[PDB]
Design a protein around this ligand. Sequence first.
Ligand code: CLA
Ligand code: HEM
Ligand code: BCR
Ligand code: CA
Ligand code: CA
Ligand code: CL
Lengths: 97, 168, 56, 243, 137, 56
Amino acid sequence: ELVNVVDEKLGTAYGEKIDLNNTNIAAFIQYRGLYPTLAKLIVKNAPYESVEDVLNIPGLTERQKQILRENLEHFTVTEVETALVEGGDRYNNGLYK
Amino acid sequence: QEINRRVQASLASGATLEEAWSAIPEKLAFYDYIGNNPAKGGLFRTGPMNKGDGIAQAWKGHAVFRNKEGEELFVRRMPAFFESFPVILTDKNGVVKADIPFRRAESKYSFEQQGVTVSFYGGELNGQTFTDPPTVKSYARKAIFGEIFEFDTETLNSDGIFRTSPRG
Amino acid sequence: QAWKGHAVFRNKEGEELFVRRMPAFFESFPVILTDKNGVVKADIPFRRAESKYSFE
Amino acid sequence: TLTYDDIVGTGLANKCPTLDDTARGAYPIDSSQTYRIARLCLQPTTFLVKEEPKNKRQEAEFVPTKLVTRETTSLDQIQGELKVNSDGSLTFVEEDGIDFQPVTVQMAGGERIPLLFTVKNLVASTQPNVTSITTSTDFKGEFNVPSYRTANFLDPKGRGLASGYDSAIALPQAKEEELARANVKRFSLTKGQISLNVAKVDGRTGEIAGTFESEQLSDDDMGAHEPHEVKIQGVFYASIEPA
Amino acid sequence: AELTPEVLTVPLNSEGKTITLTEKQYLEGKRLFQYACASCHVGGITKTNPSLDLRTETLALATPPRDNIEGLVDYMKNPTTYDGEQEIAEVHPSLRSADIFPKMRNLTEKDLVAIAGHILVEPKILGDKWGGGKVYY
Amino acid sequence: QGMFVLPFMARLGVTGSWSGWSITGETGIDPGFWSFEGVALAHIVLSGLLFLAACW
Ligand code: CLA
Ligand code: HEM
Ligand SMILES: CC1=C(/C=C/C(C)=C/C=C/C(C)=C\C=C\C=C(C)\C=C\C=C(C)\C=C\C2=C(C)CCCC2(C)C)C(C)(C)CCC1
Ligand SMILES: [Ca+2]
Ligand SMILES: [Ca+2]
Ligand SMILES: [Cl-]
C-alpha cells in the first residue's frame, strides 16, 4: 500500500513546527535571531533525538543558547525523511518567491 | 441550490442529517455532477458519456468535509473552463482552510496539517467517516466534480476523460 | 515463460501412469492414462454413473 | 603543467590522474598520525547491467551497455578522513565532493538504464595491519544510493513527490487503484558496494591509483518500476595526506 | 483611495514614535529606491536572496528590528544579517562601502530617510504584492 | 512471433541488430552495416532506384 511520504509527514509535527531534522533552512527566518547563524549550525548538526538536544551543539555562545531556549517551543523532531534531506534540499529546496 | 433547499426543508422538519440526505433522489444528485456538464467534452473524444467517466452505478452520498476543529469545509468546484483544477477547501465564508498543495515544502494547508476529515450522508456510503488523508483527498478530488458517483469503468473500457452529451 | 517440469502421474498403488498424447489430427482429445504396457488405468470420464477409472 | 585551456573539450577533464609504471612503491602509515584523502577520483570505463532473468531462473548475467551521456561520468574531488583503526586496518569515511553522476547507458534492443552512479557516504576499509599502503592493499565498503530523481522532480503529467499533482488529472474519472504506483511517487534509498584495488603507489607523494568495481541499483523512476542491477568498473586515483 | 498623511505615517523607532512623510518624500523615496536598490529589491523581494524580503513583519523579526526608519537607515549605513551576527557591508551596498558600491556615494542622510520611508509605506499600499514575487504580480 | 522474412535473413547470416542484440541471444555484438535494419534499408533503397529506372 503506497504512501506519499511528504504528505504523510505533513500530518506529523513537521506540518506544525520547524522540524530540526527535516525542515528546509529558510524556515528559520520566521523567528527572531535564528537565521542564518544558528540555522546553519542546526541543519549541520542534525539529526537530533530530542528538541532540547539542539542546545548541545558545540561552540555555541550563551546568547545563542538562550535564543535557542526561547524558540524551543517552535521546534520539533520527527524521523529523518530521506526525501527531504537528500540532494542538499535542506539548504535549497528549489523554492524561492 | 435545489438539493440544498430540499435538505434544509428536511432538517427543518426534524430529520437527522443522514435521513435528510438519504431522501435526496439519486437522479437529482446525478444532475449535480460536472460529468453531465455538456461543456466538458472534446472534439475527438468520441462516443457516449459512458465511455468516459463510466456507467454510473450509484451515488456515493454527499461528501462533507471537516477539519480537526470540526468546522465544515467546502471544496471549490471546477468551472467548466478548466480541464484540470486544484483542490481547495474553504469555510462557509470562503476563507481557505485546506488544500492539496503542489509544492509541499511551505505548505500550511495540507489535509494532514489541518486534519481534514470526510463523512458521507445518503447514498452507498451513508453514515461512514474517513480520516486517513489519502482517502479524504481522493474524495475531495472527486468533490471538485460535485456529487460523487460509483462507476463501472470496466464494461466499456472507459478511459476516464469526460465526453460531451447529445446536446453538445 | 518457463517450463513447469515433467509431469509424472501415479495411482494409489504407486504405478507410474502415462498420459496418452494428442495426435495432431485432434482439436480436442480425451485424457487417458495407461501403465507402461498400455493398459488403461485412469481417465477423465464423460459419463460418471458407471465410471470405474476416475482419478478419484 | 596543464591549464584549463589545454584541457577544455578534450575529454581529459573526465579522466582521473594516472601514475606511471615505476610507481610500485609503498606509503608508510604512522598509526599515531591522522590522515586524509585530499582527492579521490573514480573514472568508470565499463557499465554492466544484469539482464532480467527469462524465467529459467538460472544465473542472469551482466551484459555490456553503450554509454550515451558522454564524458560526464566521473566522480572526483572527493575528500574525507582516513582513520587508522586499532587492528591497523584503514577506513575511509567519505565526507564530501562531486560523489555522484547521473548516467544513462543503453542496452541491446534500445532499453535505456538511467542510474545514479555514486559513492555517497562511502565507508571503505582495508585488511588489518596495513602499516603501509602497497600494491597489495585493497579497500572494501558500501555507500548510499539515493533516488536518481530528488523529491521535486515532476513526471510529464505533473505528478511528483515533494511537489506536483497527486493524481492523473488528464483522466479525472479513471479508477485510481490501477494507477496508484504511478500516482504515488516514492523515494528510494538503497545500498551499494565498491572494491578499490590498488595497482600503483608513489610512496613519496602519497598518491595511489588502481582499478575499482562497484555494484548498485539503477533508477527506479521514483517507484514506477523495478530498478536494474548495475556493476560499474573503472580506474581510480587518490592522494593521501597527513592532516 | 488617496495617498493620505495617514498612509505616509510610519514607525520612526521601536519606542512607538512615528513620522509623517510628505508626498515629495515618498516620491524621492521611490526614485532613490529605484536608483540604488530595485536592481535586487524590485517589488520588495530579493533577487540574490529570495529567502529575505522587505515585508514589514519580516523586517520586524530581523535583528536589530528593521521595521522602522532608524533600523533601515542604520541598515543602509551598516548592514547585518537577519540575526545581526555579521556585518555585510562588503557584499551589500552601504555608506560604509560607498567605495565599492559607488551608487551609494552621493546618498545623503535625507535620501536614506526617504528610502526607508518607501520601504515601510509601500506594503501599506500594495499589500501582499510587496515582497510577494511573481505569484502576486 | 510470427516472423516470416526474419528467418530467411538469419538463415544466410544476418543475425544482429544495430541496437545490439542478436537472435542467438548474444549482447554487445556489432553486426556492422548488414544488420536486419541494414538489409531492410538496402531493400528500400533498391526499391526506389528500380522505381526510377522503370520510369526511364
Ligand atoms: C447531426 C449530426 C449527428 C450528430 C449530432 C451525432 C451525434 C452523436 N452520434 Mg451520430 N452519426 C451521424 C450524425 C450525427 N451523430 C451520422 C450521419 C452517422 C452515420 C455515419 C452517425 C453514426 C453514429 C454512430 C455509429 C454512432 C454515433 C454516435 C453518436 C454520438 C457520438 C458523437 C461522436 O462521437 O462524435 C464524433 C465526431 C467527430 C469526431 C467530428 C467529426 C469531424 C469531421 C471528421 C470533420 C471533417 C473535416 C473535413 C474533412 C474538412 C474538409 C476541408 C475542405 C472543405 C477544405 C453522438 C451523440 C455514437 C454513439 O455513441 O451512439 C450510441 C455511435 O456509435 N453516430
Ligand atoms: C540602498 C540599497 C539597498 C537597501 C537599502 C536594501 C535593503 C535591504 C534590507 C533592509 C535588508 C534586510 C532584509 C531583512 O532583514 O528582512 C536587505 C537584505 C539583503 N539585500 Fe538589500 N537592499 C538594497 C540593495 C541591495 C542590492 C544592490 C543587493 C545585491 C547586489 C542586495 C542584496 C541583499 C542581500 C543579499 C540581503 C540579505 C543578506 C543577508 O541577510 O545575509 N540589496 N536589503
Ligand atoms: C555491387 C556491390 C553492391 C551491389 C549493388 C546493387 C545491387 C545496385 C544496383 C544498381 C541499380 C539498381 C541503380 C539504380 C538506377 C537507374 C538510374 C541511375 C536512375 C534513372 C532515370 C532517370 C535518368 C529517369 C529520369 C525521368 C524520370 C525520373 C521521370 C520521367 C522523365 C524521365 C524518364 C526523364 C552490394 C550492395 C551487393 C555490396 C557490394 C557489391
Ligand atoms: Ca481499464
Ligand atoms: Ca593489488
Ligand atoms: Cl516568506
